[PDB]
Design an enzyme around this catalytic site. Structure first.
Site, PDB file in Angstrom:
ATOM      1  N   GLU A  81       0.786  -1.227   0.000  1.00  0.00           N
ATOM      2  CA  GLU A  81       0.000   0.000   0.000  1.00  0.00           C
ATOM      3  C   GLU A  81       0.826   1.290   0.000  1.00  0.00           C
ATOM      4  O   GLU A  81       0.282   2.373  -0.210  1.00  0.00           O
ATOM      5  CB  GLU A  81      -0.947  -0.023   1.214  1.00  0.00           C
ATOM      6  CG  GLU A  81      -1.752  -1.327   1.318  1.00  0.00           C
ATOM      7  CD  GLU A  81      -2.383  -1.562   2.692  1.00  0.00           C
ATOM      8  OE1 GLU A  81      -1.721  -1.295   3.714  1.00  0.00           O
ATOM      9  OE2 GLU A  81      -3.537  -2.037   2.749  1.00  0.00           O
ATOM     10  N   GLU A 112       8.246 -21.596   8.838  1.00  0.00           N
ATOM     11  CA  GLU A 112       8.650 -20.748   9.959  1.00  0.00           C
ATOM     12  C   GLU A 112       9.740 -21.343  10.841  1.00  0.00           C
ATOM     13  O   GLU A 112      10.188 -20.705  11.796  1.00  0.00           O
ATOM     14  CB  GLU A 112       7.441 -20.347  10.817  1.00  0.00           C
ATOM     15  CG  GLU A 112       6.770 -21.456  11.590  1.00  0.00           C
ATOM     16  CD  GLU A 112       5.808 -20.909  12.641  1.00  0.00           C
ATOM     17  OE1 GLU A 112       4.945 -20.071  12.291  1.00  0.00           O
ATOM     18  OE2 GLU A 112       5.916 -21.317  13.818  1.00  0.00           O
TER      19      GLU A 112
END
Lengths: 248, 248
Positions: A81, A112
């Protein structure tokens, strides 16, 4: 897992699987009200992070986000954004997710836990001591993130940790530790909820505040907006008018 | 754009570009506190949506999210977390974003204005009257979403709109209108902030509440969790123990 608030059971949701639809969403909403309060407590740390990010930006560095699963996805979301909102290069704010692009839509087995993959991910974008690294993980113990922060720290880069459990290994490594204590999730361990909301709120502050301070704004007008559709194009015209009383 | 709260200037941020770092994040935090209050007002509509989604699910239908930019990305984010959290098929909750996969990382020119693309996107996944369509757009007037809701409505599918402006064209089309009035953003038009947070909160409720009611939960334990890493694998063991006092 027994010493983590994120893994703790919420006393108010013990019989959630036996409550009406309205009672479930109400309970979720009451817990949500607690997230902004949790962020208020971290404002001093968040503000410091912004100050440090702005200096790094002025030095030619970038803001780098790393995380797995939902945390990684939020870093990608916030990063995506910035160019359309502040007109900056796509390189200024980068979101890295454990597991690669496939991880955006779905989980990547053991992503992870790969402590070697994060070094490759950071070296690929030429991460340096001039950049700032934000490690995002509600648990505060995600191996992939811990290793990323350690590497960045050793390189000489400023590090920031965002986690939901106090005194986490990530916070112990990072230069600045932002600890969003949101309390036990309604569905035990579902960090995608309150912690996810907390992380989005913090990330939004890091970029919004830093971009504003860099001048990617005038008053409260989005002057550096990149119009890519009719709405944004109509807003650009509106902004010009709001700044200086003119017409279309 | 002059009749939209989402495009309105916030009185408290007129000189945000001249305020200290702490004052900026504080103001963002005060505005954030308003989002949970905005959702509380929509609980009756949100609850109804869950009830309707559960029935559709029991009828073999899917929950479909459509949106552009940040709104679309949040629908993708929420959808991606359902399989690992509730053990459901990836087809049960699907997030569709205007512009295709490229739109996840960056904006696609005129994507939210393509009224023909949404029909193609829905036909590709064989959208039917048995599915539920949630149109997500803070402005409540995104052409791509309006057309998606119209098509779904005409097909006979239940439609839901999530927007931040009251009495929007989307709300006028949708069967159930969820209106999260969060007020003017700190950076005028930056819907990625309060409206984004509001949308995530609503989406999280739609799936969490519906999944809980479908039995993808026991008490407040995530019994249908899909362990894809050490943490989740350790949690699965923990859950079993918490449900029935046993040991590893």
């Amino acid at each position: 897992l027994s010493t983590l608030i994120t893994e703790q059971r919420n006393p108010n949701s013990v019989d959630i699987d036996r409550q009406s639809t309205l009672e479930i969403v109400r309970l979720m909403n009451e817990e949500d009200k607690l997230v902004p309060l949790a962020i208020e407590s971290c404002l001093p740390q968040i503000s410091l992070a912004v100050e440090q990010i702005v200096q790094a930006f002025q030095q030619g560095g970038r803001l780098i986000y790393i995380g797995a699963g939902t945390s990684g996805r939020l870093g990608v979301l916030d990063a995506s954004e910035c160019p359309p909102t502040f007109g900056v290069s796509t390189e200024m704010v980068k979101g890295i997710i454990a597991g690669g692009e496939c991880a955006i839509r779905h989980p990547v087995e053991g992503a992870e836990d790969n402590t070697k993959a994060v070094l490759n991910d950071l070296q690929s974008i030429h991460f340096s001591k001039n950049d700032v690294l934000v490690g995002i993980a509600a648990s505060g113990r995600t191996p992939y993130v811990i290793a990323g922060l350690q590497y960045a720290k050793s390189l000489g880069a400023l590090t920031i940790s965002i986690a939901s459990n106090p005194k986490s290994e990530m916070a112990e490594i990072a230069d600045i530790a932002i600890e969003t204590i949101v309390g036990p999730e309604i569905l035990t361990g579902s960090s995608r909820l309150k912690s996810g909301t907390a992380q989005k709120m913090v990330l939004n502050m890091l970029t919004t505040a830093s971009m504003i301070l860099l001048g990617k704004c005038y008053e409260n007008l989005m002057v550096d907006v990149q119009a890519s559709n009719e709405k944004l194009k109509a807003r650009a015209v509106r902004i010009v008018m709001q700044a200086t009383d003119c017409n279309k």
